[PDB]
């Protein structure tokens, strides 16, 4: 019908590369994978989640690892919006919703997920049109960042509710160097001694700092001075050139943490209360 | 026309699988059914009650009974959707709801059920376009769990507003002994004190914290059989378990049920004064 | 041809079904039958009424005396929707709104009543369209129970505003008296002090009250006699066993008024202050 | 054709029926009759106003001489919709608009008035439409009482903005002895003492007080004498009596005028406010 | 066939009786005559201002010029409006747009004015449709007082889009000496006094301000006391008798402007910021 | 179908010659001459990007910079527009779009050029193919000028989003010297004042300024004394007329942009932020 901005979201790198959260790969492979390798065991009780709650800060990777099971899913995904924006005229924007679930038959083994639902009246329209919808074999998701306004009744539809803590040196060490996975620098790089200043860091605050040396690098020397846009030789031995300590000085100084850690204190004391599995 | 958007809301399980309510549950297995039956004694004054009011929080088996009655129903349900489309095209479809009830006098008998109706201009103009259609013999009903937004006549035009709280520890004991129907479980165990451990939870708890077990069977079980294709061991036996008390244990300290019923305490104190039976 | 629409508009008991209005009774009695039974006098200066106001809390008898009036009248009436539906391929029925009066000709003396006239741009536009069209002999009213929602001219242009009142003990008396017709009951039955536990109440209370122990005429009995089928003697004695104050008790305990005073309170301090009689 | 629907826009009592306005009535014979019967001062820079700016608290006698001039009117008046459908079949009902004056002029110097035409696309394309088509000698009128309503060009395109206060008080002494026409009444009538205590309302308040007392005549007398087709000596005798100051007590007591000066004053100031004499 | 529409859309005084927008006289002597007498120059760089924008507070002579414009150019002109109300019959208009600049260079280098053009599909259609047919050598323009409303891509394509603010004291004492003319009038006047009062008022006010003490004349004497309808030689004396300040002091503290100021500075700052010159 | 019009979309010029942005020349070195020589620095994270638009006034060099990196590049160009205005004989410029991919895997490093980028419903035929496919190192790039032209998130996608600032001056000059050709001036200008204080303007700007001293010509003389209907030689000698720097004065410094420098802020910050490089 007006499926311009329904069609639109039509849709079609590795599973592991993120490292961390043992209990929720597992799961989540346990969920996914094994039904279809045994439909037999998951039924009725024994049946699996078609989704759960979830939340962490942002670029944390939960947009990441989409791709990455995007990536895994040999089953079919279908993309989001946050904005159903129908107009006055226009009106009716979960009936769009009522041909994604057909969507989600029609690519029978489906699979969607969003961040942030806490995206008026309208909003209490459309929000509450997904709940008799939600409920073949389909898997779906979503996310926040601030599950402190956890709305209505999430603390009960859905089985697990996460929130992710940072994670920690040992891990941001193990994370730097598998974000510094064949890179050009030099061995005074102990990855322990620069984390501890990358304490409060997400995953995208390490790779723009290593992404911020990785262009200082380019910017050291006469980087100014062109070949007048031809090749000199050490031009393409700065791939040959290493990155150091003082490449990371600029980087160092340059990136910060700069975020609200109490939230994640406070979204983490939500989650051990009303915050499910 | 809409006509056949119209016909969208065409429609085409057991009792006991409900505990509780044995008030409310005679009431309407008597006032639905034996309507049919008694004819001549139902009738007059004795009316069947074509609807009332409803109250408690959701997933409260709300949406499983509404299930339970459809492939119970010796009547002709309606498929029903909320979101009855707003169009610059026609801009009514309380007029198709006039046409509803066409098909409801058509399909003589008939049932329809919806649920959080407290669903500016279209509000009250296609609310009270309904309210103009609300008043042979014919069923229909609706609920909510915010009778804080008991609009402006719903409340006084209902039998009864029916609010529930939690099962107790019998319930749950029936609850328990229902979901583990069918299901390798284990002996030792004592379902009754396991209901003592239940304090202030859903229906959907005991379910979902049964498959918690569940899972807990993979998670006793090698679980790090990723072997992937290769059957072994794990295709080899997943009935083999019996469910006992210690994953129910591990279950346990992975809840984090929902959020405090204060809301379900407020409605509760509407659901005396101002909620009818 | 959307004109058959209004051919589907047209239309094709007893007063002392209802109990007070003196007033308003006397008032309509008189506005409506004498001047049709003395059409000389009440013409002219004595201009018989055409409208008027009015409004209160629903379930008031404001449908029970529409359709009364409608199968009491010796005259035409045509019936009522807020259904001028919005085409964007024509979008004006305001010329059905003049066919309307047309069908006032047509049917020279006619009758109409519609309720909850909240019924943007069109609102206006078709609105306003009928105070062109509004102004032989023919009587037409309209209600609503937000007087505080009095538009903008709908107060200046009527008048009798009115407010009614709800019933009083002996109001409440002949009420269930009436309501207890077709009734064989108990003598113990004291009407009185029953009209003394049911204040906060209108004549709806009392309908669903009397199905209440309706119902209970059942639920005094071995109420599961789930036999099926087997004639129980109850099916047999159903209209047998009597009313009897047991069954107003269980009624009463069950029943809230669902009601809000401090609204009907609003506009009865309205109902003085711009309020008309 | 819907040229054809333009000869529904056709049409074919006196000015000291009312009373008060000296100053308008005065613009008014002056600036309609004088030119038509004095051509040779009027015009050129002494050209006649053939439309310009109005105002009121409505139903204030406003319809009311848009009839009673009718009755004046020697010249060719037509009849005045503000209902041309919105069909999408045709492009614009604009198009009889643009016929409208060749209709003006094919017939006479010609008169025109509407009320309350404060009055999305189309709506504004036909009113621009219109704007063109104002702009030999023929009239035009139109009014309101929205003082927003000068929506894009309507301050500067009327000469005048007119507008009518709430009466002063020996307005409502000529203004009740103008209601008592035609009256058989009691000369114990204290006419100050009527229009003090009567005070800040408007005629048709008058109007229906007038038709209170009226009704009121029978409702002392044996309104009671429901036999129904036997005549009464009063139903013959009814003009035979007289009205009487108790008459208007209950007459006082029984109304709010249902309307609140708050617009009325808001208007109040743009009638000084961008608002022209 | 239809298209004769446009055959009717045909049409066939002074010119310099503005005072104001001295530039604008120039450019629109310049761009409009001396190409018609000298393209030698005018060619290339020199070629004429194809078109340009329009706009200002309505009833500023802006809409009462092209009469001046026409009534003295030599060259054609022919009628616009926004008139291109197709029918589903025809589905179309802008063939008349084909046939349109196709008629402009069939008889002449023609004129060509609308106002207001900022006038669902159809827009599109005869706006694409137009604005390569759009595109010997000839002008056109148009207007509007909605630059809310403006366009980019007419804002893009043409050359200037000119406002203008009211007038200022001493074109508006000219232009009460332009009001004065054919006028008896006194000789206390001081036509920079008279024109102090001229807070917010354009020179359309002042039009009716003359015609207001011109109708003061005769409302100092007396109208309804008739001659009989007789022509009093009074009325004579009225050719005889002077306007003079008094007879305009009460129209200047009778009347406002009608109007409001800040829209005229909105478009004053648009007419700055992304309006042309 | 459109081989042959697509064999037109084939392309292949100093690249100093668009000037400033020295970090951008760095860019293109480091995406025409790089992306072509050494990827072996341009790898995983250093990869070569995919493709990017670019906020910016026209005027710019937007098509300058392109056809110089063109013909510069080792990699091939094409002329490429959003005007493959398709048909039904054509059916499908969506597969112009894969066909778009299949020249330039054929070509296989090769350059694509476009704008009108937001130029019905076949802007999203082709748009959803494109965003589709667009997954080696053939880079492509597109353009616009509205910063709010991000679709959804189709600026999301891409590798960057950049503004870009004013020009530089001595082209300014020179360009003044290109439009001002063929034309009567004088000898005495100053063409870098006159290109200093070009401060915030483009170029169709400045070849009205061109006409606006052209007419400047006249308009130091007097257009309103003409010679009498007389072409006097001084008429035609204003073609034989010397245009100055003086005669620009009021050319220069009434003359404005009339657009908004403080919204390119906006979009340059987002450029700085939120916008990649
Ligand atoms: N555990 C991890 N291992 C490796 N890389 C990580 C990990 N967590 C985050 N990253 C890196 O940080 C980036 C953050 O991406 P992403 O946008 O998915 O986070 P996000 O929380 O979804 O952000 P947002 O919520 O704002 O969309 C990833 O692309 C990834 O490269
Ligand atoms: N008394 C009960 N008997 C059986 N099942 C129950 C009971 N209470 C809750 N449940 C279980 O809880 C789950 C959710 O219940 P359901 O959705 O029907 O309640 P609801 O009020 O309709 O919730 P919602 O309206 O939010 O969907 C069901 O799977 C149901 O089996
Ligand atoms: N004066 C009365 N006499 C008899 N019955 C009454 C009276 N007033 C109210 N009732 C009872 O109240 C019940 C509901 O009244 P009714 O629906 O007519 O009011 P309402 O304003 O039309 O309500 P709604 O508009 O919400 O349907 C009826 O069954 C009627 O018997
Ligand atoms: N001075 C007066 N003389 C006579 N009647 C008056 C006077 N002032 C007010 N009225 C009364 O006002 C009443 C209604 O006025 P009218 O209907 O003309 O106004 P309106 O605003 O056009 O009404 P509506 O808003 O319904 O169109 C008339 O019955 C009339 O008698
Ligand atoms: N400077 C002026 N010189 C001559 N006449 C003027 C001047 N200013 C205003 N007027 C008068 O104002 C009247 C209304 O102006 P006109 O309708 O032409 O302008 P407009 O703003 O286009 O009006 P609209 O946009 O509402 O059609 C004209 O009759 C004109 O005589």
């Not at 979830?54 to 791709?67: D, E, M, N, V």
């Not at 489906?110 to 009246?121: A, L």
């Not at 980087?223 to 300590?245: D, I, P, Y």
Request: proline residues 4%.
């Amino acid at each position: 019908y007006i499926v311009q901005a329904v069609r639109g979201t039509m849709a079609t790198m590795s599973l592991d590369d993120i490292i961390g959260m043992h209990d929720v790969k597992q799961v989540l492979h346990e969920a996914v994978t094994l039904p279809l390798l045994v439909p037999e065991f998951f039924q009725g009780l024994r049946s699996p989640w078609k989704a759960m709650v979830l939340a962490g800060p942002p670029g944390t990777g939960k947009t990441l690892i989409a791709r990455a099971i995007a990536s895994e899913s040999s089953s079919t995904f279908f993309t989001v919006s946050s904005t159903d924006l129908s107009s006055k005229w226009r009106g009716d924007s979960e009936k769009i919703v009522r041909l994604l679930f057909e969507l989600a038959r029609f690519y029978a083994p489906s699979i969607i997920f969003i961040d942030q639902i806490d995206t008026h009246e309208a909003s209490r329209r459309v929000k509450s049109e997904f709940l008799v919808q939600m409920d073949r074999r389909v898997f779906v998701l979503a996310a926040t960042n601030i599950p402190w306004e956890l709305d209505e009744a999430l603390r009960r539809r859905f089985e697990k509710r996460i929130f992710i803590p940072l994670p920690d040196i040992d891990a941001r060490k193990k994370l730097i160097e598998k974000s510094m996975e064949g890179t050009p620098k030099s061995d005074e790089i102990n990855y322990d001694d620069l984390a501890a200043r990358t304490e409060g860091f997400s995953g995208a605050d390490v790779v723009s700092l290593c992404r911020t040396a990785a262009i200082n690098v380019l910017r050291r020397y006469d980087t100014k001075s062109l070949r007048g846009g031809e090749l000199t030789a050490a031009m393409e031995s700065l791939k040959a050139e290493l990155v150091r300590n003082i490449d990371f000085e600029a980087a160092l100084q340059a990136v910060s943490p700069s975020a609200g850690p109490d939230t994640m204190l406070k979204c983490k004391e939500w989650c051990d209360s009303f915050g499910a599995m």
